[PDB]
Structure formats: C-alpha cells, structure tokens
Amino acid sequence: GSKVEDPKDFPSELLSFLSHAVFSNRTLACFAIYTTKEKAALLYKKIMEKYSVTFISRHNSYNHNILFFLTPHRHRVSAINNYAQKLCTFSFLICKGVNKEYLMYSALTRDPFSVIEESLPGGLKEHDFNPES
Amino acid sequence: GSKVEDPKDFPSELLSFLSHAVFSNRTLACFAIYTTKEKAALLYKKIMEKYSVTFISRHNSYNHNILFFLTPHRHRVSAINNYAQKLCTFSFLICKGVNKEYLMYSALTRDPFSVIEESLPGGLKEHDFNPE
DNA sequence: GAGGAGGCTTTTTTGGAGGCC
DNA sequence: ACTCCTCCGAAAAAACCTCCGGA
Ligand SMILES: [Ca+2]
Ligand SMILES: [Ca+2]
Numbered sequence: 001g002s003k004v005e006d007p008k009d010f011p012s013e014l015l016s017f018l019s020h021a022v023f024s025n026r027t028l029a030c031f032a033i034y035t036t037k038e039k040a041a042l043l044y045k046k047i048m049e050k051y052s053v054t055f056i057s058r059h060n061s062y063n064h065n066i067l068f069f070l071t072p073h074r075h076r077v078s079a080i081n082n083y084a085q086k087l088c089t090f091s092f093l094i095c096k097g098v099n100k101e102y103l104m105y106s107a108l109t110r111d112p113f114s115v116i117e118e119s120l121p122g123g124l125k126e127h128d129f130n131p132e133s
Numbered sequence: 134g135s136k137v138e139d140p141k142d143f144p145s146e147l148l149s150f151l152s153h154a155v156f157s158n159r160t161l162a163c164f165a166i167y168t169t170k171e172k173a174a175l176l177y178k179k180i181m182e183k184y185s186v187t188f189i190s191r192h193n194s195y196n197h198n199i200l201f202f203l204t205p206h207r208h209r210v211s212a213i214n215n216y217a218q219k220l221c222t223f224s225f226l227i228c229k230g231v232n233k234e235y236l237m238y239s240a241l242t243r244d245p246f247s248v249i250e251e252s253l254p255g256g257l258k259e260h261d262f263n264p265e
Numbered sequence: 266g267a268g269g270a271g272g273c274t275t276t277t278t279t280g281g282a283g284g285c286c
Numbered sequence: 287a288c289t290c291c292t293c294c295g296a297a298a299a300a301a302c303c304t305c306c307g308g309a
Contacts, residue, residue, distance in 0.1 A: 016264055025266090025307050074306090099309095102236055103262060129236060131149055157308055232309075 006092040010034050011061060013112070017104040019077065019097035027074035030101040033067040033084060034094040040065030043084060048119065050083060051075070057118035059108040065116065068098070068105050102129035139225035143167050144194060147240060150233040155214065160207035163234040166200040166217060167227040173198030176217060181252065183216060184208070190251035192241040198249070201231070201238050235262035 010018060010032065018032065033043065044058045047069055056069040081095035098104045105124055109115055115123065143151060143165065151165065166176060177191050180202055189202040214228040231237045238257055242248055248256060 013264060026309055027306075028309095100233065100235070100262075102233070103259070106259065107263060126236070126239065129233075130240060131146060133146075152309065154309065159308060 002092065007034065007064070007094065010066070010094055010096065014066075014104065014107060017098060017100040017107070019099050022077055022081070022096060024077060024097070027076050028097040029071045029074045030098040030104075031069055031071070031075075031077065031080050032096055032098050032104060034061065034092075035065060035067075036091050037063070037065045039088055039091060039093065040067055043067060043087070044117065046087060047084070051080075053119065055119055055124065057105065057108065057123065058116045060114045060116055062112065066108060066113070068108055070101070102126055135225065140167065140197070140227065143199070143227055143229065146245070147199075147237065150231060150237040150240070152210070152230040152232050155210050155229060157210065157230075159230075160209055161230040162204045162207045163231040163237075164202055164204070164208075164210065164213050165229055165231050165237060167194065167225075167229075168198060168200075169224050170196070170198045172221055172224060172226065173200055175221070176200060177250065179220060180217075184213075186252065188252055188257065190238065190241065190256060191249045193247045193249055195245065199241060199246070201241055203234070235259055 009015065011034075014032075019028070033040070033047075035043070040058055044056060044067060047053060047067060048056050051069065051071045054070045054072050056067065059066045059068065077095065077097040081093075084095055085093055102124075106126070107113065109123070142148065144167075147165075152159075152161070166173070166180075168176065173191055177189060177200060180186060180200065181189050184202065184204045187203045187205050189200065192199045192201065210228060210230045214226075217228055218226055235257075239259070240246065242256070
C-alpha cells in the first residue's frame with residue numbers, strides 16, 4: 001500500500017533546492033514533479049501544453065522520474081499540483097516549487113540523476129539563469 | 134554629493150540573485166555588501182570576526198567592491214546592515230540578502246567581476262552548495 | 266493580507282479645424 | 287503698441303486602485 005511503498009517527498013539530495021511551503025500564496029515560475037515513470041512520460045506533454053512552458057525536462061531518478069519546468073507566467077504551487085493530481089488517479093505524485101532553479105536542474109543532469117528528454121536541444125546552462133546581457 | 138555620485142543598488146547583472154526586501158523580518162545566512170574598495174577591505178575582516186562566517190570573499194566590481202558571505206546562524210538583513218553602516222560613517226554602502234547563493238558567488242568570479250581575496254583557498258564550487 | 270509597484274482608468278492639456286447632418 | 291471662440295479627439299499627466307503576497 002501507498003504508506004509502505006510510496007515516496008513521501010523528493011529525494012533527499014534535492015530537498016534544499018525546493019520550497020516546502022506547498023500551500024503558499026507566493027507564486028513561482030519554476031516547479032518540479034516527482035512521480036512514476038509511466039506518469040512522468042505522459043505528464044511531460046500535458047504540462048508543456050497546459051502551462052505553455054518556457055522549458056521542461058524529464059529525468060531518471062532510480063526507478064522513478066522527475067519533471068523540472070519553467071513557466072512564462074507565475075502560478076501557485078497548489079494550482080500546479082491540483083492539475084497534475086487530477087489527471088491520473090493512481091500512484092504517487094509529489095509537486096513542489098523550486099527556489100534554486102539552476103542548482104535543481106543541474107543536479108538533475110548528474111549522478112544519480114540523468115536527462116531522459118528535454119524541450120530544448122542541449123538543455124540549459126548556468127549562463128541561462130543569469131540576466132540576459 | 135551622494136545623490137549624484139553614489140550607486141543606489143547593486144550592479145544590474147546581480148539583482149535577480151538578491152532579496153530587495155531590506156526591512157524584512159525574514160532571516161538568512163547569505164549576504165552581499167556593495168561599497169567602496171577601501172571600506173570593503175576593512176569590512177572583510179570585521180564581518181569575518183563579528184559574524185564568525187563560514188565563508189567570505191571580496192570581489193572587484195568596476196571601481197568598487199562587493200563582499201559575499203555565508204554565516205553559521207541566520208540574521209535579518211537589517212541587523213547586518215546596521216552593523217556595517219555604523220562602523221564607517223562615510224561613503225555608500227548597499228547591503229542585501231542573497232536568495233541565489235551559488236549563482237551570486239559564481240557570477241562574482243567572472244567578468245566583469247573577479248575575486249580579490251577569499252577565506253578558503255580555491256574558493257567555492259557548485260558541489261559545495263549541494264547537500265554534503 | 267501589509268504596502269509598494271505598476272498598470273488601468275480618468276482628467277487635464279492640447280491643438281486642428283468648424284460653419285443649418 | 288504688442289494675450290482670446292468653440293468643439294471634440296488625441297495625448298500627456300495625474301490619480302487611484304488592483305495585484306502580489308513579510309519574495
Ligand atoms: Ca560603513
Ligand atoms: Ca507569506
């Protein structure tokens with residue numbers, strides 16, 4: 001059952017990068033979703049369409065997957081979560097706002113994580129999280 | 134006079150990394166100071182002692198300097214500012230909490246910025262802002 | 266949900282052109 | 287030897303009010 005089998009949070013390696021105030025009124029434009037591989041593969045396209053994302057990437061996380069995305073306008077975390085939870089009503093799903101957007105994405109590119117697919121060829125680099133010059 | 138001559142904020146390249154809510158009750162453990170070179174050189178040591186910093190670095194920023202530091206316990210920005218402003222009562226000084234600690238320090242190491250001195254040999258790397 | 270920022274809304278300034286619709 | 291009609295739309299200024307949210 002879920003209490004025994006499901007993760008209750010993101011992997012510990014990533015927690016310092018996230019907002020844990022999942023009910024906050026402070027809107028954001030960078031989010032992460034932790035879920036099953038089956039679900040993450042479907043959600044990748046759905047998120048991309050629903051939120052007209054500037055950028056999305058899907059990452060391996062041992063048996064499971066993580067989505068990382070950036071939106072053109074800001075949203076409450078509870079809004080993103082509600083959309084994601086209602087699409088598929090089986091299995092776990094953890095949704096959190098990302099405070100350290102570069103560090104998050106960058107860690108998701110390296111052991112124990114890796115990129116499965118992303119919406120821009122070559123992905124992102126530290127430069128892209130600096131102001132445009 | 135100050136209104137004509139002094140910077141009123143950090144350089145624009147760095148603003149997205151900082152908290153602008155300088156009067157906030159929110160405590161933090163990463164701060165930056167923008168001031169003159171002669172003030173920054175003295176403050177480097179004073180900060181290090183007053184706040185028992187885990188790390189501090191002084192950076193060139195065109196004619197002026199920026200201090201970047203990390204503290205072992207959290208403080209209000211106003212507390213750090215109040216200490217810094219009262220030490221030397223001449224010239225400008227801008228103090229702000231840092232939201233994007235790695236991006237801030239990393240940008241302070243590259244053109245147009247550079248490291249003048251720092252409290253650990255070799256400084257910091259992205260690995261250091263990940264969990265141990 | 267304070268209080269500042271910035272934007273929608275409204276008023277004031279402005280000046281080209283009217284003359285029995 | 288030197289300051290006057292009016293109407294109405296556009297544009298500029300000012301006022302106010304919504305938005306985000308102790309970031
Ligand atoms: Ca001073
Ligand atoms: Ca709040």
